[PDB]
Amino acid sequence: SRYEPVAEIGVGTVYKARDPHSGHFVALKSVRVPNGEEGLPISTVREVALLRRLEAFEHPNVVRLMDVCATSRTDREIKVTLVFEHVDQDLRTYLDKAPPPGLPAETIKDLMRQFLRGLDFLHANCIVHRDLKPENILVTSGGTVKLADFGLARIYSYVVTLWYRAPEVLLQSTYATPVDMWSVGCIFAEMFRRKPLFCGNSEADQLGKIFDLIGLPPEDDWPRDVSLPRGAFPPRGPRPVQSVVPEMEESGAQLLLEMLTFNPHKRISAFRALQHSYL
Amino acid sequence: DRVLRAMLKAEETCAPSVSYFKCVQKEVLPSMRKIVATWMLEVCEEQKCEEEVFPLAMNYLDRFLSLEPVKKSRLQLLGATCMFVASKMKETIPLTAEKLCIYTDNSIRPEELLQMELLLVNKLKWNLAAMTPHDFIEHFLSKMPEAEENKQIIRKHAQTFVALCATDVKFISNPPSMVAAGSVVAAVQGLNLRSPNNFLSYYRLTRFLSRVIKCDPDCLRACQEQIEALLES
Ligand SMILES: CC(C)n1c(C(C)(C)O)nc2c(F)cc(-c3nc(N[C@@H]4CCOC[C@H]4O)ncc3Cl)cc21
Question: In what residue span(s) does the Cyclin N-terminal domain sit (chain B)?
Answer without folding.
Answer: 4-128
